[PDB]
Amino acid sequence: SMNPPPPETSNPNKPKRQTNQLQYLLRVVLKTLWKHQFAWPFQQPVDAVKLNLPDYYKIIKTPMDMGTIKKRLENNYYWNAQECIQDFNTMFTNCYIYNKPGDDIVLMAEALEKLFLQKINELPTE
Template sequence: FQITSHEWSAPFLQPVDVVGLQLDDYHKIITKPMDFSTIQNKMEGKDGTKYKSVREIYSDVRLIFTNAMTYNDEHHDVHIMAKLLLEKFEEKWLQLLPKVENEERKQQVEPNDVPTTDTSPEDAIAKLAKDTDDEVGPLMDCYSFYCCVGID
């Protein structure tokens, strides 16, 4: 099951329609809006930005849900949906974190070390995704992370 396919994911797939929803105070409360389409664009290098690490993707996915919980009252449907999806996302992240940390250690090159491979960080992240696929599902493919976070 994928996070963007979850029945409650719709409010988080595209940027908040501030004008259409008449949310005049949205940008005063939410200083860094985020949504899954923006994450996808950043993964693809659109808009001149690109993620440098898996942790940046993780941070932006969290931001989607924390923004929704910040803006909406705790009894609002969007707040409740964001809270549940964030909890599920965090559960999956904790399962993956040891592999992420291991890959980060591999990527750190000491000043006197000579790299033994031409693996780019993107390739290393993709390899990490492949290696963890059997254990925690399709959670970390660098180019489809935003839609492939498994939700039970």
């Protein structure tokens, strides 16, 4: 089996910005989720080879993970906060699509998503 190329974290002809909201997404949102006890399945792209999940990238066609998000934020890849919020939501949705209610990985995603929502609720005005 083979893994796909990971999502890009740099693209020189994509216009970039730093906004106060994107700074909050790195310094508050990403940092809070990244340090959580349940972060570790989400800190890098799913390695379908090592996990023996040959169907993962047959089912998940828009993969996303916090390692990618972290690099995108550190590289100022985004134009706006909504792009980054969408990446987080894609990561969570992929987990719920591939897995089953009650699976450990789903409980982990749910805990991280609760914290994500608590922090996003306090996103500063631009």
